[PDB]
Design a protein around this ligand. Structure first.
Ligand SMILES: CCCCCCCCCCCCCCCCCC(=O)OC[C@H](COP(=O)([O-])OCC(O)COP(=O)([O-])OC[C@@H](COC(=O)CCCCCCCCCCCCCCCCC)OC(=O)CCCCCCCCCCCCCCCCC)OC(=O)CCCCCCCCCCCCCCCCC
Ligand SMILES: CCCCCCCCCCCCCCCCCC(=O)OC[C@H](COP(=O)([O-])OCC(O)COP(=O)([O-])OC[C@@H](COC(=O)CCCCCCCCCCCCCCCCC)OC(=O)CCCCCCCCCCCCCCCCC)OC(=O)CCCCCCCCCCCCCCCCC
Ligand SMILES: CCCCCCCCCCCCCCCCCC(=O)OC[C@H](COP(=O)([O-])OCC[N+](C)(C)C)OC(=O)CCCCCCCCCCCCCCCCC
Ligand SMILES: CCCCCCCCCCCCCCCCCC(=O)OC[C@H](COP(=O)(O)OCCN)OC(=O)CCCCCCCCCCCCCCCCC
Ligand SMILES: CCCCCCCCCCCCCCCCCC(=O)OC[C@H](COP(=O)(O)OCCN)OC(=O)CCCCCCCCCCCCCCCCC
Ligand SMILES: CCCCCCCCCCCCCCCCCC(=O)OC[C@H](COP(=O)(O)OCCN)OC(=O)CCCCCCCCCCCCCCCCC
Ligand SMILES: CCCCCCCCCCCCCCCCCC(=O)OC[C@H](COP(=O)(O)OCCN)OC(=O)CCCCCCCCCCCCCCCCC
Ligand SMILES: CCCCCCCCCCCCCCCCCC(=O)OC[C@H](COP(=O)(O)OCCN)OC(=O)CCCCCCCCCCCCCCCCC
Ligand SMILES: CCCCCCCCCCCCCCCCCC(=O)OC[C@H](COP(=O)(O)OCCN)OC(=O)CCCCCCCCCCCCCCCCC
Lengths: 83, 114, 98, 98, 291, 70, 106, 96, 347, 175
């Protein structure tokens, strides 16, 4: 509208410090939801191994669990190197 | 209550891996790919059994695979490895990223001789 | 129990008696109320840290925030008492006897 | 709880921190995890009146891990006896232990 | 060997503070079109010695104890602030070095309270209470600003700020924070235009050393640690010189105005930028490592 | 002139330079000419405590390599 | 030990430099110099400023673990609770601001 | 720039953590042999010191369960030099 | 207060209590008490006078002492059980500390001295919250820890409270003093039956709140705070004197009024456990409460005290106070005895 | 002797408590609480609580006790009293130190004392843990869990602090 651009133009003239603060805080709240890279933050936190990776007893029907750390099976960090 | 069972000193003996922590750090990546099988059996034992006594044999094979690993290096790649872990040992944090050249020389050495 | 507990429990008791045995300054009693909190902070932190109860590690912090928030309220009352009488003496707060 | 809202709504407000055998950050265990795990599993569902007699053994073991009173008593006896023989020169610590 | 190290830290600090007084008087003089000390020793280099001797032989309270505690607390805590500083290696390597400095800096407000209390003058006391209110008010923005910076660093370790700025100074991503930090240090050290002696001037150097580390990180080469020290020293010296520069060029604030400068400008903006810097690493996928 | 202010700055610059220079040189003098080992976490302390035992002289900054293997 | 040694030196050196500074002057033996309720009064504004500092300082302690909190896999909850704490830190200030708690006119 | 550098630092930490994971089995095995050896050593001097005490059983547990319990610092270093106990107890906390 | 702020402060008083009632964690119980105390201090000061400040300070010191003992009992319990669940405590010293902390928070004798003074020092509306809503949170904790409470301690406190409350009220002419001592005496009944049947502790809590709210609501309608000012009521609102008589007779436990119901059910629960002496002593001692209630009815409803000339000017104006739920409250306070079996809804 | 640093630190903890509990002028009262607070942080540090110990300095000492001394200076006598110059203040100090010294004597001599609870005087180190080589601080991970696990704790703690501000402005307005 135009009743609002005159409001914003008034605070920008009388209280520039607060207009900046309310602009930065809105960006902080909003941008994380709209960013396509927020998913990589969860993955990178999930990819960091703090504990020992305890192996699974190989009963005989665990096809996708690798037998060796260098085997093709299991999750990979290929996206992390390119990212 | 019963008597806490303890294996005697004779059973606890084994040849140690008497190399410093920076030597282990420098070989750690190759070490984890060469000695994975005995290493993972020991750790499966420990988590399953929850008892250091019930996994004393498996822990001796960890040393045996580790000692053999360090002889493979001492027979073919001693100098590139000595030059590499001496760079790691200098840093207070033992950082990998400070010794990428010496790490490289060590990698072609093992990828050709082993 | 361990030996250090003897003194942390001794300190809570000391500040409890100090709290219940007033003198004149109302400020001197609020400090006894904060010595009690300090002892309970240390007692809790030793228990939680020694037992490795990880998620309880934040209990001492919460206990420290709320008790300080309480002390802020207590000091405010002391200041309002000081306004009415010019001193924080506890013997001036005896109107409600009748 | 007086009003068991959490179970009705299926929302966890504070149960995550009530015991130390629960899920911890980075799967960090507490020092008495196995002892508390047993006592809870022994005592579960039977009521506290029953659990005061049918889980007594587990609860003693958990209380021994928690405060380690009996372990310290056994250690003081050995320390007391050992130093006595050192006082009378009957015993000498080995190469190690010295 | 450690005792030498602690001595090799304290004594240079006292000498540096002694000759900071000289630099202050000459730098202010030349900005005022005069010279400053150039008679006591060549180029005035003996002026600090003359002042010191004269001060300690000059002829010299409500609470005798507090009149002794106040100088010790300020002097003891001013020196303690230097023990974790990576220059490039700290004297005491702490995992919570940043947190340690906020804690010790907070205790500095006690000497102000005790010295005012021990004076015995009602007038002296209220002057101390005004100084205590200024300090704690501006400790709020120091803590929040510092927290916003540490979200790009990843820990409380002071040597990790060296690694954080391996490619680029934090002043570029955080210049709005560096601005409010720099003013807050002046207010925290009660320097002009917020002035409404050994320990005082030791803090001034230490806060500017801490500023160089926080915002103007110097590259460290482990094989040549001395280069970091030289570059590090130059950055802190110029930051300290800018305190002198600022003092010469401005009038003083009123007391209510500097309270308003924080409670109504820095804090509202410092809060928003804290929100911004919590969100930014998450949305950009640039969260720093925890170790 | 302004450059007559430099000598005072030179004395400050040297003074603030010594603490860092002394610490770095003392650390290497006390650690066989290497950086002082940093142990912020138990894992680093554990490796530092193992280095002390392995060294054979009770000093964690003496390193042992393949010359101890056989 | 190192930290305790450093603190002991710092506060021992301060103590020495303080006592001798109290005693070196009496070397001169200067001539004797003949120089023969409970509220200041205090203003409620200088009390509120201290209390507002305390309450904001408490809410800062809640934020200090933020650098470590960003390392969790539950980042959506962490971010929501972090922005919640800072916003209520702003809400408190806005209440102070609009009720003249931040004034100095009497 | 901060984003690019911080990503690179996360990758280095993953490599740093992975070197530890490769070495944890070997350190875990030696830790087990040191704990049991220390416990076995303590049991011997317990037998000698407490031989003459009537009613004593050597190596008796204080627990009803026959499960393995991690010993506390008192059980391991309960008969050793104060220098070794001090380093094992407070060494990490007092370092730097 | 600004009305919006007043509402928020009241909802924080309620929020703190609810946090205690829904929490399964001891820290959240402590937090609820801390939050609750924080928000109630404002409404006690809201008229700003030396008496309101003295009441708020005496309240703050008493409640703060109780919370530190509660936290101390919570930490001792953690040391001996390694858990935080709100349930029976696992150490007798923890139980003594918690029981005394809750006794102090309730104002039970001998931790009673603050109740008459703090209540007299605040407004009637604030006093209503102090003597009614404030009992819920401590009571709901006693409800859950009772299997570990020391019987001699809980019964010792209860008997002391029934004596102190009964005797203290005999010497009072201030309505807020009378209500405070009535509150102390009634707390003694709720904790006497707690070791035997916690349900009858809730029954007596509910009915005591309903009758206490009715009294305060009726005192607030005419702004009467002394015995003699209440004795003018017959000459302004004659209806109010009848309701005051009925409620006071109900609080006395006289059949067939609702206040007889809790005392009836507690005597039944105590004799089932072969407690004959204690309920007999308790019931007789409660006659003290009936006496200084009966005194109030004499000067209010059963006689006509002298009036004043200026009372004629009041006849021309109507009551404008809200008197919320007063018609419902007075009918629950007097006519509920026939529905006594409905107490099972609290099981 | 350093092996009982935690016990020695806790003895000074109690002496500082006897300090302000005997209740001298509220200015030495605040000095004793500062010394105990600092000594109390030392105990927490030696148990692995680096962050908890530093939160004591930053918040308790540099926040709460600063406001105490500030408030004390604005409304309390202004003139202190020579510590122990008053009979009651001195009588309680000696009484406390006598019981503090008697507890210390019987626990160290007998390696055990019994007051309400049973206390064992073998040392504090004997209960320390003998197993950890994780590459993180457990304290920090526990505290950092507040934002993930403790959504409910943060909400109520945040509300109480906001309400504290609102409450404290009402209390002091005077109308
Ligand atoms: C979802 C909705 C949640 C509902 C609760 C909302 C809480 C905010 C209260 C709103 C309000 O009072 O209006 C603002 C309003 C603000 O106006 P103001 O100008 O700023 O105040 C002027 C004075 O400063 C102040 O006014 P005053 O000095 O002239 O006198 C005030 C007096 C005015 O006169 C009265 O209100 C007396 C009648 C209320 C007492 C009876 C309550 C019911 C007793 C339980 C039995 C019910 C079955 O009201 C009060 O005393 C306030 C507290 C009364 C509650 C006493 C707690 C009794 C224990 C109940 C336990 C059982 C709960 C579960 C059931 O204050 C009022 O006086 C309202 C009167 C008219 C509307 C009444 C609506 C509320 C009635 C009480 C509801 C009871 C629920 C439990 C409350 C617990 C509180 C701790
Ligand atoms: C489903 C939930 C089940 C419970 C249903 C409760 C619905 C009734 C709500 C009545 C109500 O709004 O509260 C009266 C509420 C409180 O006013 P008050 O001063 O305490 O007394 C009522 C006025 O005299 C009333 O004077 P008024 O001329 O202003 O009358 C206006 C009022 C109509 O006035 C009324 O009818 C209020 C009287 C209804 C009874 C009071 C509620 C009792 C709740 C049941 C209690 C049962 C006790 C347990 C049963 C015994 C044990 C088995 O109109 C409305 O409330 C509109 C209905 C919106 C809902 O007043 C108003 O409604 C607006 C003013
Ligand atoms: C006012 C004067 C204040 C003087 C300083 C007080 C002590 C501060 C210690 C501190 O917080 O150090 C953080 C530092 C922070 O270290 P850190 O937590 O980063 O790392 C510890 C070491 N690692 C990482 C290997 C685990 O504390 C330590 O270094 C750990 C403790 C070391 C041993 C010291 C224990 C006693 C501490 C001093 C007790 C003082 C008692 C009070 C004196 C009277 C009141 C002032
Ligand atoms: C101003 C208008 C507010 C805009 C924000 C609305 C919230 C949108 C939302 O739902 O957040 C989700 C967001 C997207 O991530 P997503 O993986 O989809 O999470 C959902 C998992 N089922 O998840 C995120 O990225 C984080 C969301 C942060 C939102 C912060 C909002 C402030 C919280 C404090 C409230 C104060 C009271
Ligand atoms: C100009 C750039 C510069 O400072 O030179 C860099 C040089 C070594 O590079 P370095 O900064 O250590 O590493 C960069 C990545 N870490 O470092 C050096 O050249 C040595 C330092 C000389 C340059 C001084 C630093 C720039 C000036 C900042 C001083 C503070 C001025 C404050 C003014 C504000 C107040 C008005
Ligand atoms: C917007 C999100 C999307 C972003 C995209 C970009 C768009 C930007 C648009 C932003 C528009 C915001 C407009 C807000 C203007 C501020 C309101 C105002 O006019 O306040 C004026 C008033 C002045 O006060 P004063 O100077 O003392 O009195 C007058 C003397 N002549 O002061 C007052 O009335 C008192 C108010 C004080 C409280 C304001 C500051 C909040 C507290 C600090 C936290 C700052 C961060 C914000 C937190 C909110 C949640 C995010
Ligand atoms: C339900 C099952 C259980 C059964 C138990 C019995 C329950 C009954 C009590 C429940 C509550 C109901 C209260 C009844 C109120 C009666 C009010 C009334 O009848 O009028 C009072 C009268 C009116 O006064 P006025 O304002 O002048 O109106 C005149 C009209 N133009 O005002 C006057 O004129 C002044 C009266 C003088 C004072 C007389 C005192 C005696 C009153 C006796 C009635 C109260 C008895 C309560 C005890 C129960 C009895 C068993
Ligand atoms: C075991 C528990 C461990 C804690 C106890 C060890 C002492 C710890 C310090 C606590 C000291 C509290 C006593 C100080 C006090 O508050 O005294 C108040 C009061 C005297 O107050 P005042 O106004 O100064 O003089 C009036 C005399 N007509 O009281 C007096 O009459 C003065 C009495 C001073 C002697 C105090 C004796 C120790 C306190 C009793 C401990 C019992 C437990
Ligand atoms: C004005 C606003 C007042 C404050 C309320 C707004 C706060 C908004 C921010 C919090 C929203 C919840 C964020 C969330 O998603 O947390 C989910 C959390 C569990 O986390 P999750 O990752 O989903 O894993 C499952 C484990 N249960 O699951 C949870 O623990 C969430 C449960 C939180 C309870 C919310 C209800 C709060 C109502 C009382 C508020 C008290 C303070 C204000 C009171 C007003 C006055 C009375």
């Amino acid at each position: 509208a135009e009743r609002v651009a005159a409001f914003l133009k008034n605070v920008w003239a009388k209280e520039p410090v607060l207009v900046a603060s309310f602009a930065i805080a809105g960006l902080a709240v909003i941008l994380p939801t709209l960013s396509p890279y927020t998913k990589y933050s969860l993955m990178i936190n999930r990819a960091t191994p703090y504990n020992y990776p305890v192996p699974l007893r190989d009963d005989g029907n665990m096809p996708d669990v690798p037998s060796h750390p260098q085997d093709p099976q299991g999750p990979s960090l290929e996206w992390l190197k390119r990212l | 209550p019963g008597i806490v069972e303890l294996p005697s000193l004779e059973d606890l003996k084994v040849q140690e891996v008497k190399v410093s922590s920076s030597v282990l750090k420098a070989a750690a990546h190759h070490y984890g790919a060469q000695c994975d099988k005995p290493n993972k059996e020991f750790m499966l034992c420990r988590w399953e059994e929850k008892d250091p006594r019930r996994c004393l044999e498996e822990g001796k094979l960890v040393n045996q695979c580790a000692l053999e690993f360090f002889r493979q290096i001492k027979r073919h790649c001693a100098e590139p490895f000595t030059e590499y872990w001496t760079c790691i040992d200098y840093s207070g944090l033992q950082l990998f990223r400070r010794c990428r050249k010496q790490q490289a020389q060590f990698d072609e050495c093992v990828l050709d001789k082993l | 129990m361990s030996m250090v507990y003897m003194n942390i429990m001794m300190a809570f008791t000391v500040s409890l008696v100090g709290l219940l045995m007033y003198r004149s300054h109302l400020m001197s009693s609020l400090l006894c109320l904060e010595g009690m909190m300090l002892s309970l902070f240390v007692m809790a932190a030793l228990t939680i840290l020694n037992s490795h109860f990880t998620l309880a590690s934040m209990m001492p912090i919460i206990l420290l925030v709320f008790a300080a928030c309480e002390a802020a309220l207590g000091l405010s009352l002391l200041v309002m008492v000081s306004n009415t009488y010019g001193t924080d003496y506890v013997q001036n707060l005896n109107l409600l006897q009748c | 709880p007086f009003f068991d809202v959490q179970k009705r709504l299926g929302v966890d407000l504070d149960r995550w921190m009530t015991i130390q055998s629960a899920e911890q950050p980075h799967k960090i265990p507490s020092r008495c995890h196995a002892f508390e795990k047993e006592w809870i599993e022994c005592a579960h569902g039977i009521g506290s009146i029953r659990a005061e007699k049918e889980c007594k053994i587990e609860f003693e073991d958990f209380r021994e891990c928690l405060l380690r009173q009996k372990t310290m008593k056994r250690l003081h006896a050995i320390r007391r006896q050992r130093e006595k023989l050192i006082k009378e020169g009957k015993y000498t610590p080995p190469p190690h232990h010295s | 060997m450690f005792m030498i190290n602690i001595l090799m830290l304290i004594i240079p600090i006292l000498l540096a503070v002694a000759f900071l007084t000289l630099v202050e008087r000459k730098v202010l003089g030349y900005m005022q079109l005069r010279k400053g000390p150039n008679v006591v020793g060549p180029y005035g280099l003996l002026q600090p010695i003359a002042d010191a001797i004269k001060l300690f032989i000059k002829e010299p309270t409500s609470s005798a104890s507090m009149f002794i505690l106040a100088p010790i607390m300020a002097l003891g805590l001013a020196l303690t602030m230097w023990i974790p500083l990576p220059m490039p290696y700290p004297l005491i390597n702490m995992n919570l070095g940043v947190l340690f400095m906020l804690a010790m800096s907070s205790l500095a407000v006690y000497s102000i309270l005790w010295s005012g209390w021990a004076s015995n003058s009602k007038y002296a006391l209220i002057g101390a209470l005004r100084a205590v209110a200024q300090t704690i008010s501006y400790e709020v923005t120091l803590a929040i600003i510092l927290l916003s910076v540490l979200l790009m660093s990843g820990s409380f370790t002071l040597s990790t700020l060296i690694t954080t700025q391996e490619q680029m100074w934090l002043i570029l991503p955080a210049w709005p924070l560096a601005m409010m930090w720099f003013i807050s240090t002046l207010a925290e050290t009660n320097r002009a235009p917020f002035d409404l002696f050994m320990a005082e001037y030791a803090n001034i150097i230490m806060m500017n050393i801490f500023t160089a580390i926080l915002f103007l990180g110097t590259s460290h080469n482990p094989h040549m640690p001395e280069l970091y020290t030289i570059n590090f020293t130059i950055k802190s010296l110029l930051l300290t010189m800018s305190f002198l520069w600022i003092r010469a060029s401005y009038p003083r604030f009123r007391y209510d105005q500097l309270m308003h400068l924080l409670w109504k400008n820095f804090l509202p903006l410092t809060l928003a930028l804290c929100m911004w810097h919590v969100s930014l690493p998450i949305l950009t996928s640039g969260i720093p490592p925890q170790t | 002139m302004w450059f007559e202010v430099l000598p005072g700055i030179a004395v400050m610059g040297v003074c603030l330079f010594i603490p860092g220079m002394a610490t770095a040189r003392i650390h290497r003098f006390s650690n066989g000419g290497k950086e002082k080992r940093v142990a912020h976490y138990p894992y680093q302390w554990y490796l530092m405590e193992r280095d002390r035992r392995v060294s054979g002289v009770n000093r964690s900054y003496v390193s042992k390599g393949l010359e101890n293997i056989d | 030990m190192n930290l305790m040694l450093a603190l002991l030196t710092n506060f021992t050196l301060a103590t020495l430099l303080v006592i001798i500074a109290f005693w070196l002057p009496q070397l001169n033996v200067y001539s004797e110099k003949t120089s023969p309720s409970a509220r200041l009064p205090f203003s409620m504004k200088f009390f509120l400023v201290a209390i507002t500092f305390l309450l904001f300082d408490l809410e800062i302690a809640l934020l200090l673990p933020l650098p470590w909190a960003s390392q969790t896999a539950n980042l959506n909850t962490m971010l929501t609770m972090a922005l919640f704490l800072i916003i209520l830190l702003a809400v408190s200030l806005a209440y102070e601001w609009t009720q003249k708690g931040l004034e100095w006119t009497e | 720039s901060m984003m690019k550098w911080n990503r690179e630092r996360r990758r280095l930490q993953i490599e740093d953590f992975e070197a530890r994971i490769a070495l944890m089995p070997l350190l875990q095995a030696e830790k087990d042999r040191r704990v049991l050896q220390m416990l076995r050593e303590n049991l011997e001097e317990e037998a000698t010191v407490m031989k003459d005490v009537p009613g004593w059983k050597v190596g008796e547990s204080v627990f009803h369960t026959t499960r393995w319990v991690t010993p506390m610092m008192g059980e391991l270093y309960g008969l050793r030099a104060s220098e070794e106990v001090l380093s094992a107890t407070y060494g990490f906390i007092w370092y730097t | 207060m600004n009305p919006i702020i007043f509402i928020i402060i009241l909802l924080t008083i309620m929020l703190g209590t609810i946090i205690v009632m829904i929490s399964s964690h001891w820290l959240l119980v402590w937090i609820g008490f801390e939050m609750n105390m924080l928000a109630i201090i404002p409404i006690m000061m809201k008229n700003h006078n030396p008496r309101a400040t003295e009441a708020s300070t005496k309240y703050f010191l008493t409640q703060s002492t109780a919370s530190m003992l509660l936290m101390m009992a919570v930490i001792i319990n953690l040391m001996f059980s390694g858990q935080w669940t709100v349930m029976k405590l696992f150490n007798p010293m923890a139980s003594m500390l918690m029981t005394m902390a809750l006794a102090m928070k309730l104002g039970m004798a001998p931790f009673h001295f603050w109740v008459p003074e703090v209540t007299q020092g605040i407004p009637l509306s604030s006093g209503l919250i102090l003597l009614t809503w404030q009992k819920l949170a401590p009571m709901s904790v006693l409800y859950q820890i009772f299997p570990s409470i020391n019987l001699n301690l809980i019964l010792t406190l209860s008997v002391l409270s029934i004596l102190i409350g009964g005797w203290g009220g005999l010497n009072q002419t201030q309505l807020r003093k009378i209500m405070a001592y009535s509150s102390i005496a009634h707390m003694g009944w709720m904790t006497a039956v707690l070791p035997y049947n916690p349900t009858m502790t809730l029954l007596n809590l509910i009915i005591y709140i309903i009758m206490t709210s009715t009294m305060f609501t009726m005192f607030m309608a005419n702004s009467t705070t002394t015995t003699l000012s209440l004795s003018h009521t017959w000459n302004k609102t004659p209806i109010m004197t009848v309701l005051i008589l009925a409620t006071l007779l109900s609080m006395g436990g006289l059949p067939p009024l609702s206040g007889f119901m809790p005392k009836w059910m507690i005597i039944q629960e105590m004799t089932k456990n072969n407690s004959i002496i204690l309920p007999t002593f308790m019931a007789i001692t409660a006659l003290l409460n009936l006496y200084f209630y009966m005194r109030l009815t004499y000067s209010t409803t059963l006689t006509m005290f002298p009036s004043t000339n200026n009372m004629k000017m009041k006849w021309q104006f109507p009551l404008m106070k809200k008197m919320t739920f007063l018609p419902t409250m007075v009918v629950l306070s007097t006519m509920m005895l026939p529905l006594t079996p409905m107490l099972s809804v609290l099981e | 002797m350093m092996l009982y640093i935690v016990f020695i630190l806790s003895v000074i903890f109690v002496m500082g408590f006897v300090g302000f509990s005997s209740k001298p002028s509220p200015i030495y009262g605040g000095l004793g609480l500062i010394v105990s607070g600092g000594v109390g942080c030392g105990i927490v540090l030696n148990f692995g609580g680096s962050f908890l110990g530093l939160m004591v300095f930053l918040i308790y000492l540099g926040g709460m006790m600063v406001v105490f001394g500030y408030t004390t200076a604005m409304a309390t006598e202004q003139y202190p009293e020579i510590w122990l110059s008053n009979k009651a203040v001195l009588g309680a100090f000696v009484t406390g130190l006598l019981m503090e010294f008697f507890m210390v004597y019987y626990v160290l001599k007998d390696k055990e004392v019994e007051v309400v609870f049973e206390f064992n005087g073998l040392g504090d180190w004997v209960i320390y843990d003998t197993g950890d080589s994780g590459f993180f601080s457990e304290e920090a991970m526990g505290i950092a869990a507040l934002y993930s696990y403790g959504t409910w704790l943060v909400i109520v703690t945040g509300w109480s602090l906001l309400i504290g501000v609102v409450v404290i402005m009402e209390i002091t307005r005077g109308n």
